[PDB]
Structure formats: C-alpha cells, structure tokens
Structure 1
Amino acid sequence: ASKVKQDMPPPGGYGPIDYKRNLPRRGLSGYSMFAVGIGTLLFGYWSMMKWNRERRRLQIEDFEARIALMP
C-alpha cells in the first residue's frame, strides 16, 4: 500500500550554495584621498587667514578705545 517516505533532497537537488570569499573593494585611490585632505587643509587655512586678520583689526580697535579712555 504505502511507499517509502524519508528525508531526501527534492527532485533536481538543491540550488548552488555560495562559498567563495566576497570582500569587495569600496574604491578610492590614494591620490584622490590625499588631494581631498590637502584641499580641505588649504580651505581651512584660507578661512583662518581671513578670520584672524579681522580679529587683529578688532583688537586694534579695542586698544584704540582703551588709549582714548586712558588719560
């Protein structure tokens, strides 16, 4: 009557199983990274130049006010 029934793989087998290493490269050359670093350094230098010159002028103005008030 009944037939044999046990754990067997399905007909046609199972699908392929990935086993190879997969470590993809994110991707950016060293030249590009160094250029980005130097560029942001230069931008910071320029902004600091302008801001510190303005600060020098402001300090000179304050010193002038003190000089006027001194006598």
Structure 2
Amino acid sequence: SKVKQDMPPVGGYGPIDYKRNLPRRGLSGYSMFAVGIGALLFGYW
C-alpha cells in the first residue's frame, strides 16, 4: 500500500509568529503629569 509517515499538510502549515510584540499603551508624559497635577490641585482645593 501507499507509504504513510508523518508529513506536513499539502500546502504546509499556516504562518507562525515569532517577532517581538510589545504593544504601545498609555498616554504621553505630558498628559500623565497633567492628570497627576490636576488630581493634586483638586485635592488641595
């Protein structure tokens, strides 16, 4: 009968990621300081 052994599927496997993926999150430094200082000024008031 026909040879049968472990092989990849016809057409191969789907693509595999490997590259580093660390997405960008958060606000700029300006906004972060603005929120912090705004919180301080509300607290003082």
* Residue aligned with 1:36, SS: helix
Taking structure 2 as the reference length, the TM-score comes to 0.91
RMSD, matched Cα: 0.7
CA shift, 1:13, in A, is 0.5
Structure 2 residues not aligned, in runs of 5+: none
Q: Aligned pair count?
A: 44
CA shift, 1:4, in A, is 0.4
CA shift, 1:27, in A, is 2.9
CA shift, 1:19, in A, is 0.5
Distance of 1:40 and 1:3 partners within structure 2: 74
Taking structure 1 as the reference length, the TM-score comes to 0.59
* Residue aligned with 2:22, SS: coil
* Residue aligned with 2:34, SS: helix
Distance of 1:34 and 1:3 partners within structure 2: 70
Percentage of identical aligned residues: 95
CA shift, 1:33, in A, is 0.5
CA shift digits 1:3-32 (9 cap, x unpaired): 100001110011110011000010310010
Structure 1 residues not aligned, in runs of 5+: 46-71
